[PDB]
Every structure is written in C-alpha cells, then in structure tokens.
mmCIF file of C-alpha atoms in Angstrom:
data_model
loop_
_atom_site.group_PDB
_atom_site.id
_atom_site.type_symbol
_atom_site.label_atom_id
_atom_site.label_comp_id
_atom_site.label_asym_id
_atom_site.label_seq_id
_atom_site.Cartn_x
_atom_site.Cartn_y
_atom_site.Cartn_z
ATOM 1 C CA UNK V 351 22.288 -24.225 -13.427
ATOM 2 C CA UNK V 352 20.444 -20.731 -12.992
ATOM 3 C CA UNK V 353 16.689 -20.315 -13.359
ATOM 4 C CA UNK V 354 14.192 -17.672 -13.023
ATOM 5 C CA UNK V 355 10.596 -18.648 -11.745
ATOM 6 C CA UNK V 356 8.057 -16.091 -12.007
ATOM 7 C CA UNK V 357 4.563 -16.541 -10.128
ATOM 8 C CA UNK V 358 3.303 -13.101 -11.922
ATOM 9 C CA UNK V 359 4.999 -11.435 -14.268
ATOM 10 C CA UNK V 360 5.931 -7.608 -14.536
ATOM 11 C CA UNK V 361 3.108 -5.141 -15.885
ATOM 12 C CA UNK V 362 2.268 -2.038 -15.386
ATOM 13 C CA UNK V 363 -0.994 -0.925 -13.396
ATOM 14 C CA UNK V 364 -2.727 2.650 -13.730
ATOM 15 C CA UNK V 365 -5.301 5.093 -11.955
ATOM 16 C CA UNK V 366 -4.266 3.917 -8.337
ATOM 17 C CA UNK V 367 -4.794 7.300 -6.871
ATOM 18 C CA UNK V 368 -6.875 8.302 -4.095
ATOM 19 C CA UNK V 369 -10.766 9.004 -4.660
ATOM 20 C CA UNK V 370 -11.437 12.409 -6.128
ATOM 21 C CA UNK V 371 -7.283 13.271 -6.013
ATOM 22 C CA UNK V 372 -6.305 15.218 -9.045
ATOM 23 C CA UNK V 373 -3.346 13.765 -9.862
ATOM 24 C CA UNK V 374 -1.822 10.836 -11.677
ATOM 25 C CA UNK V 375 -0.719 7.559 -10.498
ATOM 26 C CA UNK V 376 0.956 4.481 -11.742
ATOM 27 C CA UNK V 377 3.249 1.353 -10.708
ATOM 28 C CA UNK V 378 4.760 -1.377 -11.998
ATOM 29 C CA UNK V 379 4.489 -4.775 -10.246
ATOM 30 C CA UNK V 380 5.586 -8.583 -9.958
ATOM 31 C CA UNK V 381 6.531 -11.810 -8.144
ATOM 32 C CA UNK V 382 9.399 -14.042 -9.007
ATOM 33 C CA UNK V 383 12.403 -15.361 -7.429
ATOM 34 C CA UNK V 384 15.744 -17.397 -8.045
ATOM 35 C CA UNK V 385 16.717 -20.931 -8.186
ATOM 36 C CA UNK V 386 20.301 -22.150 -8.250
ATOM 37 C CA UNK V 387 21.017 -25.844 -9.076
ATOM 38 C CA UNK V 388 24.447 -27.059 -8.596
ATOM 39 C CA UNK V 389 26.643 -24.139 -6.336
ATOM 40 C CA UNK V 390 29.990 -26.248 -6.261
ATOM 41 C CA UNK V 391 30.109 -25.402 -9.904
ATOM 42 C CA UNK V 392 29.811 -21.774 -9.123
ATOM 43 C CA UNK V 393 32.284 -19.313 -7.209
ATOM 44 C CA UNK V 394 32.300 -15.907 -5.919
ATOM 45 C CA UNK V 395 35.124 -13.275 -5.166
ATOM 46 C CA UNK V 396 35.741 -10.280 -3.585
ATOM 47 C CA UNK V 397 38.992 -7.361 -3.628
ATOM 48 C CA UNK V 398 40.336 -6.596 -6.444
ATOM 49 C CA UNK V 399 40.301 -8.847 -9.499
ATOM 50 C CA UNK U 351 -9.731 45.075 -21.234
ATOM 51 C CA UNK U 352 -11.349 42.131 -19.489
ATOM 52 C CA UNK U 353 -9.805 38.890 -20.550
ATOM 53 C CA UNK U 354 -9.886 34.726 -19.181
ATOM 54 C CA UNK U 355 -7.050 33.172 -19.011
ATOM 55 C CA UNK U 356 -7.507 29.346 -18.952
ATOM 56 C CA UNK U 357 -5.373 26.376 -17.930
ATOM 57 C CA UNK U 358 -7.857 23.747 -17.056
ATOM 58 C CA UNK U 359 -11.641 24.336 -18.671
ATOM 59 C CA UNK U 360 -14.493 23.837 -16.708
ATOM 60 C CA UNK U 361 -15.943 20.343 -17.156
ATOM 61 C CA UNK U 362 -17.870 17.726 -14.873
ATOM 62 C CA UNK U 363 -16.107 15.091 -13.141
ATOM 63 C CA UNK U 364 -18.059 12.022 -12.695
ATOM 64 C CA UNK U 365 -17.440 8.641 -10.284
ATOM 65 C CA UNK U 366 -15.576 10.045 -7.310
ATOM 66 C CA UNK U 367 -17.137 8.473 -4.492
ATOM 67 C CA UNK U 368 -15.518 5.892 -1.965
ATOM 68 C CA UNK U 369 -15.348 2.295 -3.420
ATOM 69 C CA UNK U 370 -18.092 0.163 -2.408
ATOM 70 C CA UNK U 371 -20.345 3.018 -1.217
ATOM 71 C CA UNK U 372 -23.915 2.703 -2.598
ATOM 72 C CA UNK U 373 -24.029 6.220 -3.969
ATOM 73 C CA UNK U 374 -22.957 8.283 -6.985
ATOM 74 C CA UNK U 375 -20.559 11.658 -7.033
ATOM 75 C CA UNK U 376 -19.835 14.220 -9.326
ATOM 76 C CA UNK U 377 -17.874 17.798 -8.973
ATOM 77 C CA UNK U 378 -17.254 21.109 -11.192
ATOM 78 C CA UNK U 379 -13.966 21.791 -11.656
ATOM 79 C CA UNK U 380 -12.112 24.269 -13.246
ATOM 80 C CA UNK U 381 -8.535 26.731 -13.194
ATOM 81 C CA UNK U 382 -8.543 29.801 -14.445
ATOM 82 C CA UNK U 383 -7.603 33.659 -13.673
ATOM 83 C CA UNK U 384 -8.270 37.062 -14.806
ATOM 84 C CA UNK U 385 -6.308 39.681 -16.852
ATOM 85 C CA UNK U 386 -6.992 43.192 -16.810
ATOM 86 C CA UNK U 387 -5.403 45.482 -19.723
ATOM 87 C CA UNK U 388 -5.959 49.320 -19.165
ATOM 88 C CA UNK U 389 -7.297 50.333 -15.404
ATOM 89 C CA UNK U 390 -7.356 53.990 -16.108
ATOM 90 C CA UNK U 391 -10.441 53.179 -18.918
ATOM 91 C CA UNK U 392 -12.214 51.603 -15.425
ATOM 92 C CA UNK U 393 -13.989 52.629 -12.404
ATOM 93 C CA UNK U 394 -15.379 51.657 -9.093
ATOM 94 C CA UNK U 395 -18.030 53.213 -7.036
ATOM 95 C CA UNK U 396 -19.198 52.842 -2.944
ATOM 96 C CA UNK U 397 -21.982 54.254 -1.484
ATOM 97 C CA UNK U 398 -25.645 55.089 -2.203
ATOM 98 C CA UNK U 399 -24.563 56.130 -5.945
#
C-alpha cells in the first residue's frame, strides 16, 4: 500500500557559482512525494517498544 | 637566490561576464610568492647613485 511518485528524479547539477567567483559549486536536486493507500492496515507507536 | 614559488600558474580565464549581457570577459589570474635564499650576497641603494 506504499508508493513513491517522483515528478524529477535526483541528479546532481555543477558550476552554479557566482560569475567570475573562484570557487566550486555543486547540488543535488529533486521532486517526489508519498502516497499511502489503505492506512487502517497500517499502525504507528510511540514509548518504548 | 631569487626563486618563484607557484600554487596557481598564470593562465587566462575566459566567459565571466553576467548572463545575458551582450558582451564578452576575460581576466589574468595567477598565485604566486617569492623566496629569497642568502640576503647578505644582496644590496639596495637610494639616492642619486
């Protein structure tokens, strides 16, 4: 009952420094989110065990 | 006695200008220092002569 659905997927992007900066620069990026189906099927707890 | 010590060699740098800008940029750029080995072998003279 768990899904991922990704609109972009992760990759990494280089050389996003400013103009005429000496120095280095790089990110990674994405865009994706979560989908649950059925949460009666599903529990959560909290405290110990 | 007279000696260059190098970390980054002098080179051009080409395509620094602001994005868009109908114009084209370029710098020198370069690191470096000097190193002097026996001073007593060396002189320096002010004045006329």
């Amino acid at each position: 009952g768990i899904k991922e659905r990704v609109l972009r997927a992760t990759k990494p992007e280089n050389d996003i420094q400013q103009v005429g900066q000496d120095s280095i620069k790089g990110q990674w990026i994405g865009e994706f989110g979560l989908e649950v189906n059925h949460e009666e099927t599903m529990a959560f707890a909290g405290g110990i065990a």
